């Protein structure tokens, strides 16, 4: 994830802009992770 970021148009690039390409679900608490997953879906 880390290096990858999306630009305001909607294209990937390597890292400035406050919106990564990948959202990290693994690592977080269950109830949060599921909220993220369900919110995204």
């Amino acid at each position: 994830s880390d290096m990858n970021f999306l630009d305001e148009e909607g294209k990937a690039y390597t890292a400035q802009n406050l919106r990564p390409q990948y959202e990290v679900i693994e690592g977080m608490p269950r109830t949060i992770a599921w909220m993220v997953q369900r919110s995204l879906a």
Partner: protein, 733 residues
């Protein structure tokens, strides 16, 4: 011609007209002032019934302990607490033999329940003894203080969420040499002001760390608070009841859950059987005993009641009961279940306020705290108290508390004691004599059926039952209990006479206005009639009368008479206007001076739902305005069916706290309230479903709001400004 209302009983039998022997239209007796005398009475008597046992000084607390169990049997009918372990174990073995699998199954259910049980479970214990402030507090507050206190002693079991780690921390906290806890104290601070003198002094509260030594902590952890029981019906003199600490709650819950899981499967236990089902049990249990011995078989029913029920039953037995019942369960669960009895075996009793001494000459009065109880010549106390205080001495503690090893408190191990009663009912016979007894148990109240060939045998069966119960520490009330030929009897104010008769009086106090609010009390008011028509035998005329009487009470209590009527009042002045303004007057609720549209057939229908189609759009709009200010933040004993409208309001908080030193708790409260009100905005389901997680309460909100922001941006709700601002804010957090 002298009228005699008893003469009715010449025509109608007493069970048939039992309602007329209950004065429930009258006032119930309340207590006045201190209950220390009543508490001391219990302390003296509880030991009076076991003083021939074993006296010994507890090396832990330093208190005087008395042990009746496996003591010398009684040679008289004075309430005996000298139970015999072996006999209890046999009585249990019988129960297990006749109910195999239940003992371990219930334990497994209780265990698997326990494992799932969280800490928040403790918040629904109503009044709880807070050991930090030594006062009766709301369970939630008493818990919160205990957690925040435990946190200072490096005990974070609560943070895991489960009950087990908390209980572990509880039994662990006993080992702590010095227990630290918070205590709030005030501070002046000059806040800026536009006040001639450009400042203002507001006393800002701040928390201070305070210490208690191991023993003094353990003594509090083992302490039980006491108070006189108010409004107790059908009794002349008053008596005392106790309240427990936060520690023992978790350990009692499991034991009572176990005893419940057991009792549920017993056929001679009336607990936790609903009053309606208790008849389904009893009448059948009678029907069985009736058709059992046809040939001259005298089936006798004994209307039972126990004396000193709580004051004779000993924890040391309940411990054995847990130890037996938990045979097949693993060790940790046995150790878990064993604790509450162990605590109750070494419990301490607080003696309330104290005694008030006065001088009529000077017109002066003063309360003497329990510590200072003996800081005065005993001659200055009255004649009875002088006798009590002398007897209290050997069990009296320096800090003004009473040691009380034996006995139970009013309402503690109801289930587990009911089990012990059933265990008595389980024997049924002794020495193969020509009789058989059965019955139904409910704490201190029991009903005993005895079948035999001749009554001379029945009485010996009853005597055998008595003499048996003595060995369990259960004492039958020779004074209040009576026996008769089967056909009619009394049980927990339910009267059987070839079938259970109605006792409409019993429920009569409930007919009045409950005191929740205008919306609820109506629903409740009609529902009570509806139910009493079904269960308690109220005819349609009397019901329709009650429909009237309740509205009568309702309109006076809430001051909402008919809009067309000319009754004056602050509200009525507006009600009349509403009456003049509204077109669909029959659509108006009674609370708004509307007409009562209820009858027998639509008791089960909410008034709003009934009248909805008859309302005006503006009236129903105002009445049911979604964001009206009268209804608060709701969150999901009897429940009712009602609609959330403007009449569904809540009253003001009791303000007496404002001018005491507990002001803090208002800020402490609202401080939480803000966080919870926000957390609820972040997680709307929090009001309905209990949120779960051992992680930080802030973290969840941060993540959730971050996702909300990201999705609201990428979806096309928020603009780049709002998104960047949001992320900028969150970045700092």
């Amino acid at each position: 011609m002298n009228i005699n209302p008893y003469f009715l009983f010449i025509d109608v039998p007493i069970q048939a007209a039992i309602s007329t022997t209950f004065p429930y239209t009258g006032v119930p007796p309340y207590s006045h002032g201190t209950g220390t005398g009543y508490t001391i009475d219990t302390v003296i008597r509880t030991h009076e019934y076991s003083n021939k046992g074993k006296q010994y000084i507890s090396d832990v607390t330093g208190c005087t302990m008395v042990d009746p169990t496996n003591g010398p049997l009684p040679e008289d009918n004075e309430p005996s607490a000298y139970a015999q372990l072996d006999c209890v174990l046999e009585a249990l073995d019988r129960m297990d033999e006749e109910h195999p699998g239940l003992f371990q199954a219930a334990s497994q259910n209780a265990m698997e329940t326990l494992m799932v049980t969280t800490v928040d479970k403790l918040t629904q214990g109503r009044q709880t003894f807070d050991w930090t402030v030594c006062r009766n507090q709301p369970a939630a507050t008493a818990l919160n203080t205990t957690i925040t206190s435990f946190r200072l002693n490096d005990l974070n079991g609560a943070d895991k969420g489960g009950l087990i780690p908390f209980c572990q921390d509880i039994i662990d906290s006993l080992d702590r040499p010095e227990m630290t806890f918070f205590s709030v104290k005030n501070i002046k601070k000059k806040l800026p002001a536009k006040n001639r003198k450009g400042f203002l002094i507001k006393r800002i509260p701040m928390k201070v760390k305070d210490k208690i030594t191991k023993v003094e902590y353990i003594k509090r952890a083992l302490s039980l608070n006491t108070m006189t029981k108010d409004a107790e019906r059908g009794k002349l003199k008053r008596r005392a009841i106790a309240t427990a600490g936060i520690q023992i709650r978790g350990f009692v819950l499991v034991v009572e859950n176990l005893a419940k899981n057991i009792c549920e499967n017993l056929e001679q236990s009336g607990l936790p059987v609903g009053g309606n089902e208790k008849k389904a049990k009893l009448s059948n249990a009678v029907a069985k005993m009736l058709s059992n011995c046809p040939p001259g078989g005298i089936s006798m029913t004994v209307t039972g009641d126990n004396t000193k029920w709580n004051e004779c039953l000993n924890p040391r037995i309940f411990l054995a009961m847990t130890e037996r019942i938990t045979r097949d369960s693993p060790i940790w669960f046995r150790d878990f279940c064993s604790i509450a009895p162990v605590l109750f075996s070494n419990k301490i009793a607080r003696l309330g306020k104290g005694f008030m001494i006065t001088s009529k000459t000077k017109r002066l009065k003063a309360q003497i705290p329990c510590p200072d109880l003996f800081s005065i010549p005993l001659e200055r106390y009255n004649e009875e108290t002088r006798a009590k205080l002398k007897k209290l001495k050997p069990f009296f503690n320096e800090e003004g508390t009473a040691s009380l090893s034996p006995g139970m408190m009013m309402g503690m191990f109801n289930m587990l004691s009911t089990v012990l009663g059933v265990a008595a009912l389980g024997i049924k016979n002794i020495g193969n004599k020509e009789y058989l007894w059965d019955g139904l148990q409910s704490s201190d109240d029991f009903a005993l059926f005895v079948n035999a060939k001749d009554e001379e045998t029945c009485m010996e069966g009853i005597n055998d039952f008595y003499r048996t119960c003595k060995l369990l520490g259960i004492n039958m009330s020779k004074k209040k209990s009576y026996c008769n030929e089967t056909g009619m009897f009394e049980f927990t104010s339910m009267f059987y006479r070839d079938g259970f008769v109605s006792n409409f009086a019993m429920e009569l106090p409930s007919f009045g206005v409950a005191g929740v609010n205008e919306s609820a009390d109506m629903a409740i008011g009609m529902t009570i009639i509806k139910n009493n028509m079904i269960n308690n035998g109220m005819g349609p005329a009397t019901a329709q009368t009650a429909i009237q009487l309740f509205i009568a009470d309702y309109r006076y209590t809430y001051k909402c008479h008919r809009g067309d009527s000319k009754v004056e009042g602050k509200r009525m002045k507006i009600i009349k206007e509403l009456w003049e303004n509204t077109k669909g007057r029959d659509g108006l609720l009674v609370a708004d001076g509307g007409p009562n549209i209820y009858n027998l057939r639509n008791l089960h229908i909410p008034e709003i739902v009934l009248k909805y189609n008859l309302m005006d759009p503006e009236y129903k709009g105002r009445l049911l305005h979604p964001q009206n200010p009268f209804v608060g933040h709701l969150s999901i004993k009897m429940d009712y069916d009602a609609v959330s409208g403007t009449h569904s309001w809540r009253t003001k908080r009791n303000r007496s706290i404002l001018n005491t030193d507990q002001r803090n708790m208002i800020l402490e409260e609202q401080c939480y309230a803000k966080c919870c009100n926000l957390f609820e905005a972040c997680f709307n389901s929090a009001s309905y479903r209990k949120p779960v997680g051992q992680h930080s309460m802030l973290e969840a909100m941060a993540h959730r709001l971050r996702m909300d922001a990201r999705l609201d941006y990428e979806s096309g709700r928020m603009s780049k400004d709002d998104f960047e601002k949001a992320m900028a804010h969150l970045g700092e957090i």
